[PDB]
Design a protein around this ligand. Sequence first.
Ligand SMILES: Cc1cc2nc3c(=O)[nH]c(=O)nc-3n(C[C@H](O)[C@H](O)[C@H](O)COP(=O)(O)OP(=O)(O)OC[C@H]3O[C@@H](n4cnc5c(N)ncnc54)[C@H](O)[C@@H]3O)c2cc1C
Length: 471
Amino acid sequence: ASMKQPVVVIGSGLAGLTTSNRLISKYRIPVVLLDKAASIGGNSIKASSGINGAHTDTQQNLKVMDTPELFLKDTLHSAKGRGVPSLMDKLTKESKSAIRWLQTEFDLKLDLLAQLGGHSVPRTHRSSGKLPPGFEIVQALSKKLKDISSKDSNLVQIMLNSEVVDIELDNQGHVTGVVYMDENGNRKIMKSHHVVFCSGGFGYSKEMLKEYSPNLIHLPTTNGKQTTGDGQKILSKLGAELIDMDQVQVHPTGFIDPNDRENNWKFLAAEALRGLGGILLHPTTGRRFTNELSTRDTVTMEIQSKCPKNDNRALLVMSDKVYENYTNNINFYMSKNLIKKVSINDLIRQYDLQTTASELVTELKSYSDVNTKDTFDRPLIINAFDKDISTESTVYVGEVTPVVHFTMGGVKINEKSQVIKKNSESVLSNGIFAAGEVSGGVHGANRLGGSSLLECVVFGKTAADNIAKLY
Ligand SMILES: Cc1cc2nc3c(=O)[nH]c(=O)nc-3n(C[C@H](O)[C@H](O)[C@H](O)COP(=O)(O)OP(=O)(O)OC[C@H]3O[C@@H](n4cnc5c(N)ncnc54)[C@H](O)[C@@H]3O)c2cc1C
């Protein structure tokens, strides 16, 4: 394109980074990326499990069969009759293209799989190596922007510590500008005709939880302090439709930090830790109590009922085989005191469990024997405990508890990533787009692990492609 006013991208998580890279690399359309935080990446940079895609080269390599239709069925089942099905179709159908875009344009390997809760087959992609998926993907995308930016400063500028507070519209009402508070707290206007909200969720905000799912106000969260629903509020005040705001995901396994047990913020215990063979033990009895690989709403429901009302936590216990497959990530968790390597005798005594060591050994042996059916009917049992485990064998243990993690609702969007006007199917403004967690409609009542990184890519790409038509 010929260079006009910049496209303002609000938020440097994966949604904003996708949009920015696509605009600049494919179309040479200039971007200003604003983020109210002091660093790049949002909650995206913390993602530990990976990115979904159905019918990928990775899946072909690992001989896993999967299809857009299977992914959509898992997605609809998870949605429980909420959401916009056509956006679910788009998410799942364009998932192959999303993975391929990351692999080809950024040389991200995305060569390993995990099967997460609610998924019929393994389709959550991460790269081998020392770097977890959120960090790897964000670093690759951001480094590409910073490269371009060092080279033609007018094609891309990243401005941190810049909090958007409103969009300026004319009487018609086309976008004319983005109002933001700069690093010194001064009001500034960025003139623009096109803005993409990639500003993330609202899970950290107690005030918004009070408004939309007030039962969750006392729960801890995995979200960063920036996750305050700014975009959703701005766009609502401007006349945008919000949907599914009362659908908040509580992930069952936030880590408890044994040196800061009541922190309202938690490190996440990656769902991959269960997908790859971790089990959950009741914190008093020392026994398994539920299916660890259900959807998040279900696992969370079971811990909240079956673990103690006061002291609502569980023990995530992982064998040596899980350790071999998720070594760098368990190493990180151990360096932070979140996972401890302990013998079975010591587990019992350290965690004050009612079970004897010998009793727990008999139970881990039954769990691991796939010739006996699972007490709680777990759909995938891989990387279990060794047939000859004893009370002296070592296991890896962490304490986990339910945490506010993702907001499925948000501003309503169409298939072009355009924000929809309240009480209408028309766009609020041909200039206003949204992608990622700030949007609503894509997941319905529960989001499948892996699909938030994917939404960011699918809809960030779509916003850029559509702005390119209009620019
Ligand atoms: C611990 C953790 C682990 C996760 N793991 C996974 C995973 O394995 N797979 C998966 O699919 N999903 C995962 N998720 C969800 C996922 O990582 C992303 O957070 C989600 O996809 C949202 O990405 P996003 O780009 O929409 O928003 P974010 O990554 O939250 O980025 C939003 C950005 O917008 C900025 N912002 C907010 N308000 C303003 C404002 N007013 N002005 C300017 N900028 C603003 C923020 O500062 C932030 O940097 C995880 C989330 C957490 C917390």
